[PDB]
């Protein structure tokens, strides 16, 4: 490939997947009379620790005051989890099998038989999104760009340093515009197919929070975590 310099820097921030994977597996084995949905909330929770860790030592994010950092992540935590999940399905996913953050492949058959209406609407919207990205040969350069466009959002209020946020939007957009031009020249549509996937990720993630809040009020989400604290505002 040919990777614009800014994308090379964003790539260096990607953590070692294999270590996150066994860290989350080992932790779940320790928590040990747990229910299926409760176990997955703990797996999503620890994935969110992993997301905050990545953001914390990322290029332009490390330069923000903590209050700016929180505002940005309170706005995009669920989008980052969805994007993370979606990109895991493009690379490692196969025929009828959700690839988990812990490394295993649960057959989609298992989820279909046990999932209610809300979760079916969510899992299915997620899968049509995965398949759209699968057909775009979505790669890691494009993925890390989308992550920074999601993180450095312009829909966030009360930012002390709105100038630096607007600047990384500007530069990441232009870096992605550059990468699609060099690597996929005769595929003019590519850039736009990636940007139009952002509204959809936002929507799946608002839906996911509403689902997770429904489950929390039903008493299914075991006592409080990073996920419910993000959910609380």
């Amino acid at each position: 490939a040919s990777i614009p310099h800014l994308i090379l820097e964003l790539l260096k921030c990607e953590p070692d997947e294999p270590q996150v994977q066994a860290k989350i597996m080992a932790y779940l084995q320790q928590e040990q009379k747990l229910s299926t949905f409760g176990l997955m909330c703990k797996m999503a929770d620890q994935t969110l620790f992993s997301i905050v860790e990545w953001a914390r030592s990322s290029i332009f994010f490390r330069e923000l005051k903590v209050d700016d950092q929180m505002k940005l992540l309170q706005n995009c935590w669920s989008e980052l989890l969805i994007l993370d999940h979606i990109y895991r399905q493009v690379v490692h996913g196969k025929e009828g099998s959700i690839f988990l953050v812990t490394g295993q492949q649960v057959d989609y058959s298992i989820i279909a038989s046990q999932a209610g209406a809300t979760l079916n609407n969510l899992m299915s919207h997620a899968q049509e999104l995965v398949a759209k990205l699968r057909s775009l040969q979505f790669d890691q350069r494009e993925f890390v760009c989308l992550k920074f466009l999601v993180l450095f959002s312009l829909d966030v209020k009360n930012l002390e340093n709105f100038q630096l946020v607007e600047g990384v939007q500007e530069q990441v957009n232009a870096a992605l515009l550059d990468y699609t031009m060099c690597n996929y020249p005769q595929q003019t549509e590519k850039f736009g197919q990636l940007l139009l996937r952002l509204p959809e990720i936002r929507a799946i993630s608002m839906q996911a929070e509403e689902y997770l809040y429904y489950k929390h009020l039903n008493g299914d989400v075991p006592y409080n975590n990073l996920l419910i604290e993000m959910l609380h505002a």
Binding site: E53, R56, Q69, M70, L73, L226, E229, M230, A233
Partner: peptide
């Protein structure tokens, strides 16, 4: 507001 988020961003 978010005591846990703050903890994870400081140390």
């Amino acid at each position: 507001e978010n005591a846990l988020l703050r903890y994870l961003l400081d140390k």
